[PDB]
Design a protein around this ligand. Structure first.
Ligand SMILES: [N]
Lengths: 116, 17
């Protein structure tokens, strides 16, 4: 049968829809800690860069996706998961922000599991 | 949002909202 050529382009369209959902006001009560880079110095989190090698957040992910800086859905998903796994490394497991991260990550992973 | 006063005061995240 005929060959195709647009797997990558449909993957990234799917990714923008997932990010749009993640940014939706419906999730704001638990998504807000992930909107913007952790302001390490302003917040006095002097140990953050001792624990976290590569900070990531959804505004940065949005900027990268809209600047075409992801090759495919795998690269987009890796940054999303990096931002969550940073949260889990830095904060205690019973911290309020970890519960918020796990809830938002359910939103992401549910949709990321689906075929585009 | 973060309670910045308290986040700085204890060097761990404190949620304000
Ligand atoms: N909060």
């Amino acid at each position: 049968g005929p060959l195709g050529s647009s797997k990558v382009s449909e993957q990234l369209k799917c990714c923008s829809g997932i990010l749009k959902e993640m940014f939706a006001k419906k999730h704001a009560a638990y998504a807000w800690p992930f909107y913007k880079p952790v302001d390490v110095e302003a917040l006095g989190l002097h140990d953050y860069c001792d624990i976290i090698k590569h900070p990531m957040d959804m505004s940065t992910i949005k900027s990268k996706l809209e600047a075409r800086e992801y090759r495919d859905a795998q690269e987009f998903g890796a940054d999303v998961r990096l931002m969550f796994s940073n949260c889990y490394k830095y904060n205690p497991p019973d911290h309020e922000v970890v519960a918020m991260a796990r809830k938002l990550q359910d939103v992401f992973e549910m949709r990321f599991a689906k075929m585009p | 949002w973060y309670d910045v006063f308290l986040t700085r005061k204890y060097g761990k995240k404190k949620v304000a909202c």
